[PDB]
């Protein structure tokens, strides 16, 4: 999780013990795209106290837009904040879950402060100018273990300089699988519930 002692980087929780995260979706998204976004939302609704709600008057909200890739800000940043789900590349339930989980305050798994115990970064295989994506970040690991199966973990060939080259090798067992985009892992869900006191 993001470190933010005062909790101002996170979404507020109401007197019903629900974290309302308001959002809008661009008119460019189709009816099928909206079904996928609902499916992503439904995973959070089934297992956490987070509720993604259509925005009305709230100052702080997510704007789901058809921009250049799949991305989100980390945590609540103030005012309108963008979640891009490029319509060509990103409209899949697990990818949507991944971006929404960034908005809740989570970094990529391999950005964990202790990541060097679990993966090797093969810097020579990373596209030029993309190494910043492999930086360790200032993480609160919430007393949870590293999760190779996290929805927030890059796959082995993320940002490869040439196709198929491996930028991340799990250690000591290189055959562990990383980079699933099926859905939030058990540990991803635990971390949400812990951060928001559900
Ligand atoms: Zn991400």
UniProtKB/Swiss-Prot annotation:
Record-level GO BP terms: hatching; proteolysis
Tissue expression notes: Expressed in cells of the hatching gland.
Top-level taxon: Eukaryota
Stretches assigned to coiled coil: none
EC number: 3.4.24.67
Main localization category: secreted
Catalytic reactions on record: Hydrolysis of the inner layer of fish egg envelope. Also hydrolysis of casein and small molecule substrates such as succinyl-Leu-Leu-Val-Tyr-|-7-(4-methyl)coumarylamide
Keywords: Disulfide bond, Hydrolase, Metal-binding, Metalloprotease, Protease, Secreted, Signal, Zinc, Zymogen
GO molecular function, one term: metallopeptidase activity
Function according to Swiss-Prot or TrEMBL: Metalloendopeptidase which participates in the breakdown of the egg envelope at the time of hatching. Cleaves the N-terminal regions of the zona pellucia glycoproteins ZP2 and ZP3, where it specifically recognizes the peptide sequences TVQQS-|-DYLIK (major site) and KLMLK-|-APEPF (minor site).
Protein name (record): Hatching enzyme 1.2
Species in which this protein is naturally found: Danio rerio (Zebrafish)
Gene transcribed to yield this protein: he1.2
Stretch of the intact protein here: 66 to 263 of 263
């Amino acid at each position: 999780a993001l470190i933010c002692e005062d909790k101002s980087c996170f979404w507020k929780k109401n007197a019903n013990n629900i974290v309302e995260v308001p959002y809008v979706v661009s008119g460019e998204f189709s009816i099928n795209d909206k079904s996928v976004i609902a499916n992503a939302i439904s995973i959070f609704h089934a297992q956490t106290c987070i509720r993604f709600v259509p925005r009305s008057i709230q100052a702080d909200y997510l704007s789901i837009e058809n921009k250049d890739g799949c991305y989100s800000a980390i945590g609540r940043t103030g005012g309108k904040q963008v979640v891009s789900l490029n319509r060509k590349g990103c409209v899949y339930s697990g990818i949507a879950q991944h971006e929404l989980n960034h908005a809740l305050g989570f970094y990529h798994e391999q950005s964990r402060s202790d990541r060097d115990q679990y993966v090797r970064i093969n810097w020579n295989n990373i596209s030029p100018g993309m190494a910043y994506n492999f930086l360790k970040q200032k993480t609160n690991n919430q007393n949870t273990p590293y999760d190779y199966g996290s929805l927030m973990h890059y796959g082995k060939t993320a940002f490869a300089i040439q196709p198929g080259l491996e930028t991340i090798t799990p250690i000591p067992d290189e055959n562990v699988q990383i980079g699933q985009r099926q859905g939030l892992s058990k540990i991803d869900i635990l971390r949400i519930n812990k951060l928001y006191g559900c």
